[PDB]
Amino acid sequence: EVYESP
Amino acid sequence: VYLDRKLLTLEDKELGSGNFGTVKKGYYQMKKVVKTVAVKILKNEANDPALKDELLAEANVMQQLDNPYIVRMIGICEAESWMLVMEMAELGPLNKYLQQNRHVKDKNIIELVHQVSMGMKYLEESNFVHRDLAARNVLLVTQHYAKISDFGLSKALRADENYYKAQTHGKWPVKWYAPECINYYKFSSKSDVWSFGVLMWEAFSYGQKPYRGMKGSEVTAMLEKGERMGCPAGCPREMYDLMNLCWTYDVENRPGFAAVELRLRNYYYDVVNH
Ligand SMILES: COc1ccc(Nc2nc(-c3cccc(C(N)=O)c3)cn3ccnc23)cc1OC
C-alpha cells in the first residue's frame, strides 16, 4: 500500500 | 564505525519490523555515559547479501551527515546478525504521533515541518537525495523536535550530476514521488521537495494516508490532469499554498529547499508573534 513494485 | 557487541544491551521488546528484519531499543556504553539507542537488525532467516549491502550503504550515507535535524548513526555491529545502531528518537514516527495526539496545535505542526525543511536544506547543500521523505520517516525527539530518518533509498550525487538516474524501477513509495521520478527515473533535491509537499499534507491531516483509496497508477493519472489533493481541515491557507508550490509539475520551475525553508521560517515567526 506504501511501496509499489513495477 | 565498528562497535563492540559487549558494550550493547538490547531489550526483548521489538519497536517495529519490516522485510529487512527488526528494530529494537537498547543502550550503548560510551566513554562514561550510557546512550539510549534504536537498533536495526537484519533477518538471518535466509542468507541474502542484498539486505547486507543495503544496510552498509545506508550506514555509509548516515556517517557523512552532521546536522541537528537528521538522526545520528552511532555505528555498526556484526554479531547474531548485521546491526545499524542509531541515537534513539523516543516519541517515534510523526504520522503515528499525530494520529494519537489529535489536539496538537497548528503552530506546533508548522514548527516541526520547518525543522524537517532545515534538515532537507542541509541534505540539498550536501548533494544527497533522500528518496523516501514521508511523515513515517520523520521521528520525534520531543513534541517540539523532529529529525529525518531512514536513508535506505538515499544516494550521494555524482560530482558531475544534479540528479540520480535509477537503472530499474523497484518497490517505490510512488504516492510521495514527483512526475520526473515516475516518468524518467530521475531523482534530484527538487524531487525531494515534491515529497516534502506530500509530507506537509500528511502533517496537517494529522497522519492520514495521502491519496486515500487510490492506486499508484490512479495518482499518476490524477497529477497528469493537473489535479492536486485538497486543503486539510484547519490547515492555514499559506501552508496549503506552499504544498501546491512543492507540487509544481515541471522540475525546472519547482523551488529548492533554500526557498522552501525561508518561506516556512518567516511564516513560523509570524505565527509566533500572534
Ligand atoms: C512510539 O513508538 C516508537 C518510538 C520510538 C521509535 N524510534 C525509532 N524507530 C526506528 C524505526 C522503527 C521502525 C522501523 C524502522 C525502519 N528502519 O523501517 C525504524 C528508527 N529509529 C531511529 C531512531 N529512533 C528510531 C519508533 C517507534 O515506533 C516505531
CATH code for the domain in which residue B187 is found: 1.10.510.10
Alpha-carbon span B63 to B1, nearest angstrom: 8
Q: Which three cell numbers stand for residue B28?
A: 550503548
B66 & B142 share domain: no
A3-6 long-range Cβ contacts below 8 angstroms, 24+ apart: A3/B171, A3/B172, A3/B173, A4/B171, A4/B172, A4/B173, A4/B174, A4/B215, A4/B216, A5/B170, A5/B171, A6/B168, A6/B169, A6/B170, A6/B172
Of B88, B123, B153, at which residue does a domain stop? B88
B91 and B45 Cβ atoms separated by less than 8 Å: no
Please state the domain count of chain B: 2
Give chain B's end-to-end CA distance (angstroms, integer).
46
B74 & B22 share domain: yes
Ligand 1 pocket residue status of B141, Cβ below 6 Å:
no
**Matching residue, cell 535466509:** B46
B130 and B151 Cβ atoms separated by less than 8 Å: yes
Give chain A's end-to-end CA distance (angstroms, integer).
13
Instruction: Give the SS3 label for residue B175.
Output: helix
CB atoms under 10 Å from CB of B86, counted, come to: 20
Instruction: Identify any residues that bridge with B16 across adjacent strands, giving them in sequence order.
Output: B23
B154 & B222 share domain: yes
Element (H, E) at B152: none
Domain hosting residue B248, numbered range: 89-274
Closest CA–CA distance from residue B172 to any residue of chain A (Å): 5
B217 & B237 share domain: yes
Element (H, E) at B181: helix B179-184
B22 & B93 share domain: no
> Using only C-alpha atoms, what is the Rg of chain A?
5
Element (H, E) at B190: helix B189-204
Instruction: Identify any residues that bridge with B182 across adjacent strands, giving them in sequence order.
Output: none
Of B43, B66, B88, at which residue does a domain stop? B88
Nearest-CB residue to A2 (from B170, B173, B215): B173
Q: Which three cell numbers stand for residue B78?
A: 556484526
CA B162 to ligand 1 centroid distance, Å:
31
CB burial readout B44-55, b (16+ within 10 A) else e: eeeeeeebeebb
Sequence-ordered strand ranges (E) for chain B? 8-17, 21-29, 34-42, 73-78, 82-87, 92-93, 128-129, 138-142, 145-148, 155-156, 164-165, 186-187
Angle in degrees, CA B216, B245, B231, rounded to 5: 70
Alpha-carbon span B262 to B88, nearest angstrom: 29
B48 flagged as catalytic: no
Closest CA to B174 of B224, B211, B227, B130: B211
Alpha-carbon span B175 to B110, nearest angstrom: 22
B10 and B77 Cβ atoms separated by less than 8 Å: no
What Å distances lie between residue B84 and B22, B34, B263, CA to CA? 11, 17, 35
Of B88, B122, B141, at which residue does a domain stop? B88
Crossing angle of helices B106-125/B189-204, nearest 10°?
A: 170
Ligand 1 pocket residue status of B136, Cβ below 6 Å:
no
**Matching residue, cell 523532529:** B146
B150 and B92 Cβ atoms separated by less than 8 Å: no
DSSP state of B127: T
Instruction: Give the SS3 label for residue B140.
Output: strand
**Dihedral of CA B11/B16/B22/B26: which sign?**
negative
Site to substitute for ligand 1 among B13, B17, B23, B28, most atoms within 8 A of C-beta: B23
Q: Which three cell numbers stand for residue B165?
A: 538516474
